[PDB]
Design a protein around this ligand. Sequence first.
Ligand SMILES: COc1ccc(CNc2nc(N3CCC[C@H]3CO)ncc2C(=O)NCc2ncccn2)cc1Cl
Ligand SMILES: [Mg+2]
Ligand SMILES: [Zn+2]
Length: 324
Amino acid sequence: ETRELQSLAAAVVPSAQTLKITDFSFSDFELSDLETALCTIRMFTDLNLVQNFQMKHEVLCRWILSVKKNYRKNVAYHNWRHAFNTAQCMFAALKAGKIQNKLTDLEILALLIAALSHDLDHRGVNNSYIQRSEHPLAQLYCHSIMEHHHFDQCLMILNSPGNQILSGLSIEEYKTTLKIIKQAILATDLALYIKRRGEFFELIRKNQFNLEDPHQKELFLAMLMTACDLSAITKPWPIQQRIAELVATEFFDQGDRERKELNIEPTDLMNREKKNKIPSMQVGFIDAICLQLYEALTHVSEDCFPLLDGCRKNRQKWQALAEQ
Ligand SMILES: COc1ccc(CNc2nc(N3CCC[C@H]3CO)ncc2C(=O)NCc2ncccn2)cc1Cl
Ligand SMILES: [Mg+2]
Ligand SMILES: [Zn+2]
Protein backbone atom coordinates (compact mmCIF):
# COMPACT_ATOMS: atom_id res chain seq x y z
CA GLU A 1 0.00 0.00 0.00
CA THR A 2 1.48 3.27 1.20
CA ARG A 3 4.91 3.93 2.50
CA GLU A 4 3.71 3.81 6.08
CA LEU A 5 2.30 0.35 5.59
CA GLN A 6 5.44 -0.91 3.96
CA SER A 7 7.55 0.37 6.78
CA LEU A 8 5.26 -1.07 9.41
CA ALA A 9 4.90 -4.42 7.77
CA ALA A 10 8.57 -5.00 7.30
CA ALA A 11 9.56 -3.90 10.76
CA VAL A 12 10.79 -6.29 13.43
CA VAL A 13 8.18 -6.49 16.20
CA PRO A 14 10.10 -6.39 19.52
CA SER A 15 9.10 -8.56 22.45
CA ALA A 16 6.45 -7.47 24.93
CA GLN A 17 9.25 -7.35 27.51
CA THR A 18 11.29 -5.00 25.31
CA LEU A 19 8.26 -2.77 24.69
CA LYS A 20 7.25 -2.68 28.40
CA ILE A 21 3.59 -3.23 27.48
CA THR A 22 2.93 -5.65 30.34
CA ASP A 23 3.58 -2.86 32.91
CA PHE A 24 0.54 -1.22 34.45
CA SER A 25 2.80 1.86 34.71
CA PHE A 26 3.46 1.90 30.92
CA SER A 27 3.92 5.30 29.26
CA ASP A 28 3.78 6.08 25.53
CA PHE A 29 5.39 9.53 25.70
CA GLU A 30 8.81 8.60 24.26
CA LEU A 31 7.26 6.41 21.53
CA SER A 32 6.85 7.28 17.87
CA ASP A 33 3.56 6.55 16.13
CA LEU A 34 5.24 3.62 14.34
CA GLU A 35 6.42 2.17 17.66
CA THR A 36 2.87 2.39 19.02
CA ALA A 37 1.79 0.37 15.97
CA LEU A 38 4.49 -2.23 16.75
CA CYS A 39 3.30 -2.32 20.36
CA THR A 40 -0.20 -2.98 19.02
CA ILE A 41 0.99 -5.85 16.81
CA ARG A 42 2.76 -7.31 19.85
CA MET A 43 -0.50 -7.15 21.83
CA PHE A 44 -2.42 -9.14 19.20
CA THR A 45 0.47 -11.58 18.91
CA ASP A 46 1.06 -12.32 22.59
CA LEU A 47 -2.66 -12.73 23.25
CA ASN A 48 -2.44 -15.45 20.59
CA LEU A 49 -4.95 -13.71 18.35
CA VAL A 50 -2.80 -13.61 15.25
CA GLN A 51 -2.16 -17.30 15.31
CA ASN A 52 -5.52 -18.52 16.66
CA PHE A 53 -7.54 -16.44 14.23
CA GLN A 54 -5.17 -16.76 11.30
CA MET A 55 -4.52 -13.07 10.78
CA LYS A 56 -2.31 -12.19 7.83
CA HIS A 57 0.50 -9.84 8.86
CA GLU A 58 -0.21 -7.25 6.15
CA VAL A 59 -3.93 -7.23 7.02
CA LEU A 60 -3.33 -6.59 10.73
CA CYS A 61 -0.83 -3.83 9.89
CA ARG A 62 -3.28 -2.16 7.50
CA TRP A 63 -6.09 -2.43 10.07
CA ILE A 64 -3.94 -0.85 12.80
CA LEU A 65 -2.97 2.01 10.51
CA SER A 66 -6.61 2.47 9.45
CA VAL A 67 -7.67 2.73 13.10
CA LYS A 68 -4.89 5.18 13.97
CA LYS A 69 -5.73 7.24 10.89
CA ASN A 70 -9.37 7.59 11.97
CA TYR A 71 -8.56 9.28 15.26
CA ARG A 72 -8.25 13.06 14.95
CA LYS A 73 -4.82 14.60 15.47
CA ASN A 74 -6.31 17.95 16.63
CA VAL A 75 -8.29 16.53 19.57
CA ALA A 76 -6.10 16.94 22.63
CA TYR A 77 -7.05 13.82 24.63
CA HIS A 78 -9.52 11.57 22.75
CA ASN A 79 -7.07 10.63 19.99
CA TRP A 80 -5.05 7.60 18.86
CA ARG A 81 -2.76 7.72 21.90
CA HIS A 82 -5.73 7.48 24.28
CA ALA A 83 -7.08 4.46 22.39
CA PHE A 84 -3.61 2.91 22.26
CA ASN A 85 -3.17 3.37 26.02
CA THR A 86 -6.62 1.94 26.69
CA ALA A 87 -5.66 -1.15 24.69
CA GLN A 88 -2.31 -1.31 26.49
CA CYS A 89 -4.12 -1.25 29.85
CA MET A 90 -6.38 -4.05 28.57
CA PHE A 91 -3.27 -6.05 27.60
CA ALA A 92 -1.72 -5.49 31.02
CA ALA A 93 -4.92 -6.37 32.92
CA LEU A 94 -5.18 -9.54 30.82
CA LYS A 95 -1.50 -10.52 31.26
CA ALA A 96 -0.09 -8.98 34.45
CA GLY A 97 -3.56 -9.01 35.97
CA LYS A 98 -4.02 -12.61 34.72
CA ILE A 99 -7.60 -11.87 33.56
CA GLN A 100 -6.75 -13.67 30.31
CA ASN A 101 -7.01 -17.00 32.17
CA LYS A 102 -10.75 -16.37 32.81
CA LEU A 103 -11.74 -15.24 29.30
CA THR A 104 -11.87 -16.98 25.95
CA ASP A 105 -9.73 -15.87 23.02
CA LEU A 106 -12.95 -14.79 21.28
CA GLU A 107 -13.79 -12.50 24.20
CA ILE A 108 -10.23 -11.14 24.30
CA LEU A 109 -10.29 -10.54 20.55
CA ALA A 110 -13.42 -8.39 20.94
CA LEU A 111 -12.05 -6.55 23.99
CA LEU A 112 -8.78 -5.62 22.29
CA ILE A 113 -10.48 -4.46 19.10
CA ALA A 114 -13.03 -2.53 21.14
CA ALA A 115 -10.32 -0.90 23.28
CA LEU A 116 -8.42 0.23 20.19
CA SER A 117 -11.59 1.37 18.38
CA HIS A 118 -13.70 2.77 21.19
CA ASP A 119 -13.26 6.53 20.51
CA LEU A 120 -12.85 6.47 16.71
CA ASP A 121 -13.55 9.84 15.04
CA HIS A 122 -13.99 11.60 18.40
CA ARG A 123 -14.36 15.33 17.80
CA GLY A 124 -13.34 16.67 21.20
CA VAL A 125 -16.88 17.29 22.47
CA ASN A 126 -19.09 15.10 24.62
CA ASN A 127 -22.60 13.74 24.10
CA SER A 128 -24.17 16.73 25.86
CA TYR A 129 -22.63 19.08 23.31
CA ILE A 130 -23.63 16.89 20.35
CA GLN A 131 -27.23 16.95 21.62
CA ARG A 132 -27.31 20.64 22.57
CA SER A 133 -25.75 21.70 19.23
CA GLU A 134 -28.28 19.64 17.20
CA HIS A 135 -25.40 17.80 15.56
CA PRO A 136 -26.47 15.29 12.87
CA LEU A 137 -25.38 12.35 15.07
CA ALA A 138 -28.00 13.45 17.63
CA GLN A 139 -30.68 12.81 15.01
CA LEU A 140 -29.36 9.23 14.52
CA TYR A 141 -28.97 8.10 18.14
CA CYS A 142 -30.95 8.91 21.28
CA HIS A 143 -28.40 7.81 23.93
CA SER A 144 -24.67 7.04 23.98
CA ILE A 145 -24.53 9.11 20.80
CA MET A 146 -20.77 9.32 20.21
CA GLU A 147 -20.30 5.70 21.30
CA HIS A 148 -22.79 4.49 18.69
CA HIS A 149 -20.72 6.47 16.17
CA HIS A 150 -17.47 4.96 17.46
CA PHE A 151 -18.92 1.50 16.82
CA ASP A 152 -20.10 2.50 13.32
CA GLN A 153 -16.54 3.61 12.55
CA CYS A 154 -15.11 0.44 14.08
CA LEU A 155 -17.30 -1.77 11.89
CA MET A 156 -16.55 0.27 8.76
CA ILE A 157 -12.81 -0.26 9.25
CA LEU A 158 -13.19 -3.97 10.10
CA ASN A 159 -15.05 -4.41 6.80
CA SER A 160 -12.68 -2.39 4.61
CA PRO A 161 -10.77 -4.21 1.84
CA GLY A 162 -7.38 -5.34 3.12
CA ASN A 163 -8.32 -4.62 6.77
CA GLN A 164 -10.47 -7.68 7.55
CA ILE A 165 -8.69 -9.04 10.62
CA LEU A 166 -11.82 -11.07 11.46
CA SER A 167 -12.02 -12.82 8.07
CA GLY A 168 -10.77 -16.05 9.69
CA LEU A 169 -13.75 -16.31 12.03
CA SER A 170 -16.71 -18.51 11.19
CA ILE A 171 -20.03 -16.74 10.78
CA GLU A 172 -21.28 -17.60 14.28
CA GLU A 173 -17.98 -16.51 15.87
CA TYR A 174 -18.04 -13.36 13.75
CA LYS A 175 -21.57 -12.44 14.87
CA THR A 176 -20.74 -13.06 18.54
CA THR A 177 -17.51 -11.04 18.31
CA LEU A 178 -19.21 -8.06 16.64
CA LYS A 179 -21.88 -8.04 19.35
CA ILE A 180 -19.31 -8.11 22.17
CA ILE A 181 -17.39 -5.30 20.42
CA LYS A 182 -20.56 -3.23 20.16
CA GLN A 183 -21.47 -3.74 23.84
CA ALA A 184 -17.88 -3.04 24.88
CA ILE A 185 -17.72 0.24 22.96
CA LEU A 186 -21.15 1.33 24.19
CA ALA A 187 -19.97 0.53 27.71
CA THR A 188 -17.38 3.34 27.54
CA ASP A 189 -20.24 5.86 27.80
CA LEU A 190 -19.73 6.96 31.37
CA ALA A 191 -23.48 7.35 31.65
CA LEU A 192 -23.88 3.60 31.16
CA TYR A 193 -21.11 2.83 33.65
CA ILE A 194 -22.92 4.93 36.26
CA LYS A 195 -26.24 3.23 35.56
CA ARG A 196 -24.92 -0.33 35.68
CA ARG A 197 -22.06 -0.30 38.19
CA GLY A 198 -24.27 -0.57 41.27
CA GLU A 199 -25.22 -4.12 40.34
CA PHE A 200 -21.57 -5.06 39.82
CA PHE A 201 -20.48 -3.52 43.14
CA GLU A 202 -23.19 -5.31 45.13
CA LEU A 203 -22.47 -8.71 43.53
CA ILE A 204 -18.80 -8.20 44.43
CA ARG A 205 -19.60 -6.98 47.95
CA LYS A 206 -21.81 -10.02 48.63
CA ASN A 207 -19.26 -12.34 46.95
CA GLN A 208 -22.04 -13.41 44.58
CA PHE A 209 -20.26 -12.33 41.41
CA ASN A 210 -20.16 -15.29 39.02
CA LEU A 211 -18.28 -14.89 35.73
CA GLU A 212 -19.99 -18.08 34.49
CA ASP A 213 -23.32 -16.25 34.40
CA PRO A 214 -23.65 -14.70 30.90
CA HIS A 215 -25.33 -11.56 32.22
CA GLN A 216 -22.62 -11.02 34.85
CA LYS A 217 -19.98 -11.78 32.22
CA GLU A 218 -21.32 -8.99 29.99
CA LEU A 219 -21.48 -6.68 33.02
CA PHE A 220 -17.87 -7.49 33.89
CA LEU A 221 -16.59 -6.79 30.38
CA ALA A 222 -18.34 -3.40 30.51
CA MET A 223 -16.67 -2.58 33.84
CA LEU A 224 -13.30 -3.72 32.47
CA MET A 225 -13.70 -1.44 29.45
CA THR A 226 -14.34 1.49 31.79
CA ALA A 227 -11.37 0.51 33.96
CA CYS A 228 -9.05 0.61 30.93
CA ASP A 229 -10.66 3.77 29.48
CA LEU A 230 -10.07 5.71 32.71
CA SER A 231 -6.65 4.20 33.47
CA ALA A 232 -4.70 7.46 33.09
CA ILE A 233 -6.02 8.12 36.63
CA THR A 234 -3.89 5.16 37.84
CA LYS A 235 -0.62 6.10 36.13
CA PRO A 236 2.53 7.26 37.96
CA TRP A 237 2.21 10.92 38.84
CA PRO A 238 4.52 12.21 36.04
CA ILE A 239 2.24 10.57 33.50
CA GLN A 240 -1.02 11.51 35.16
CA GLN A 241 0.08 15.13 35.37
CA ARG A 242 0.64 15.25 31.62
CA ILE A 243 -2.58 13.42 30.68
CA ALA A 244 -4.41 15.92 32.91
CA GLU A 245 -3.06 18.71 30.67
CA LEU A 246 -4.71 17.09 27.65
CA VAL A 247 -8.04 16.42 29.38
CA ALA A 248 -8.18 20.03 30.57
CA THR A 249 -7.23 21.35 27.13
CA GLU A 250 -10.03 19.39 25.48
CA PHE A 251 -12.57 20.29 28.19
CA PHE A 252 -11.74 23.99 28.06
CA ASP A 253 -11.82 23.92 24.26
CA GLN A 254 -15.39 22.61 24.44
CA GLY A 255 -16.18 25.41 26.89
CA ASP A 256 -14.89 27.93 24.36
CA ARG A 257 -17.10 26.37 21.67
CA GLU A 258 -20.16 26.49 23.94
CA ARG A 259 -19.57 30.22 24.49
CA LYS A 260 -18.93 31.13 20.86
CA GLU A 261 -21.31 28.80 19.02
CA LEU A 262 -24.08 28.11 21.55
CA ASN A 263 -23.89 31.39 23.54
CA ILE A 264 -24.02 29.51 26.87
CA GLU A 265 -21.68 29.68 29.87
CA PRO A 266 -19.85 26.36 30.36
CA THR A 267 -19.88 24.40 33.59
CA ASP A 268 -16.84 24.73 35.85
CA LEU A 269 -15.43 21.50 34.40
CA MET A 270 -15.09 23.21 31.00
CA ASN A 271 -14.49 26.82 32.11
CA ARG A 272 -10.85 27.84 31.70
CA GLU A 273 -11.40 30.51 34.38
CA LYS A 274 -11.68 27.67 36.91
CA LYS A 275 -8.37 25.99 36.03
CA ASN A 276 -7.07 26.42 39.57
CA LYS A 277 -9.86 24.04 40.67
CA ILE A 278 -8.56 21.09 38.61
CA PRO A 279 -6.99 19.40 41.69
CA SER A 280 -10.26 19.42 43.65
CA MET A 281 -12.04 18.26 40.50
CA GLN A 282 -9.63 15.36 40.07
CA VAL A 283 -10.24 14.33 43.68
CA GLY A 284 -14.00 14.57 43.12
CA PHE A 285 -13.77 12.39 39.99
CA ILE A 286 -11.56 9.81 41.74
CA ASP A 287 -13.99 9.48 44.67
CA ALA A 288 -17.17 9.53 42.57
CA ILE A 289 -16.11 7.41 39.59
CA CYS A 290 -12.74 5.73 39.91
CA LEU A 291 -11.92 4.27 43.33
CA GLN A 292 -14.83 1.84 43.72
CA LEU A 293 -14.19 0.51 40.21
CA TYR A 294 -10.52 -0.31 40.77
CA GLU A 295 -11.39 -1.63 44.24
CA ALA A 296 -14.03 -3.95 42.79
CA LEU A 297 -11.68 -5.11 40.01
CA THR A 298 -9.13 -6.34 42.58
CA HIS A 299 -11.81 -8.63 44.02
CA VAL A 300 -11.99 -10.16 40.54
CA SER A 301 -8.20 -10.34 40.19
CA GLU A 302 -5.88 -9.47 43.08
CA ASP A 303 -3.11 -8.90 40.53
CA CYS A 304 -4.95 -5.79 39.29
CA PHE A 305 -4.11 -4.11 42.61
CA PRO A 306 -1.47 -1.83 40.95
CA LEU A 307 -4.33 0.01 39.24
CA LEU A 308 -6.03 0.63 42.59
CA ASP A 309 -2.68 1.52 44.18
CA GLY A 310 -1.91 4.00 41.43
CA CYS A 311 -5.36 5.57 41.77
CA ARG A 312 -4.92 6.05 45.52
CA LYS A 313 -1.49 7.68 45.09
CA ASN A 314 -2.83 10.16 42.53
CA ARG A 315 -5.71 11.07 44.86
CA GLN A 316 -3.09 11.83 47.51
CA LYS A 317 -1.15 14.12 45.17
CA TRP A 318 -4.27 15.85 43.83
CA GLN A 319 -5.70 16.39 47.31
CA ALA A 320 -2.39 17.91 48.42
CA LEU A 321 -2.52 20.24 45.42
CA ALA A 322 -6.15 21.18 46.16
CA GLU A 323 -5.17 22.15 49.73
CA GLN A 324 -2.71 24.45 47.88
C1 LIG B 1 -10.58 20.98 33.49
O1 LIG B 1 -9.70 19.93 33.55
C2 LIG B 1 -10.19 18.79 34.31
C3 LIG B 1 -11.44 18.83 34.91
C4 LIG B 1 -11.89 17.69 35.66
C5 LIG B 1 -11.08 16.58 35.79
C6 LIG B 1 -11.59 15.31 36.63
N1 LIG B 1 -12.73 14.72 35.97
C7 LIG B 1 -12.56 13.85 34.77
N2 LIG B 1 -11.36 13.33 34.46
C8 LIG B 1 -11.25 12.57 33.38
N3 LIG B 1 -9.96 12.00 33.07
C9 LIG B 1 -9.70 10.89 31.99
C10 LIG B 1 -8.44 10.49 32.23
C11 LIG B 1 -8.27 10.65 33.84
C12 LIG B 1 -8.89 11.80 34.16
C13 LIG B 1 -7.96 13.05 34.07
O2 LIG B 1 -7.03 13.04 35.18
N4 LIG B 1 -12.31 12.27 32.54
C14 LIG B 1 -13.52 12.75 32.79
C15 LIG B 1 -13.69 13.56 33.91
C16 LIG B 1 -15.02 14.11 34.22
O3 LIG B 1 -15.17 14.81 35.16
N5 LIG B 1 -16.19 13.77 33.33
C17 LIG B 1 -17.48 14.35 33.65
C18 LIG B 1 -18.43 13.37 34.53
N6 LIG B 1 -18.04 12.98 35.69
C19 LIG B 1 -18.81 12.16 36.46
C20 LIG B 1 -20.05 11.74 35.96
C21 LIG B 1 -20.44 12.18 34.71
N7 LIG B 1 -19.63 12.98 34.02
C22 LIG B 1 -9.86 16.54 35.22
C23 LIG B 1 -9.39 17.69 34.45
CL1 LIG B 1 -7.80 17.66 33.70
MG1 LIG C 1 -15.48 7.66 24.59
ZN1 LIG D 1 -12.19 6.70 25.89
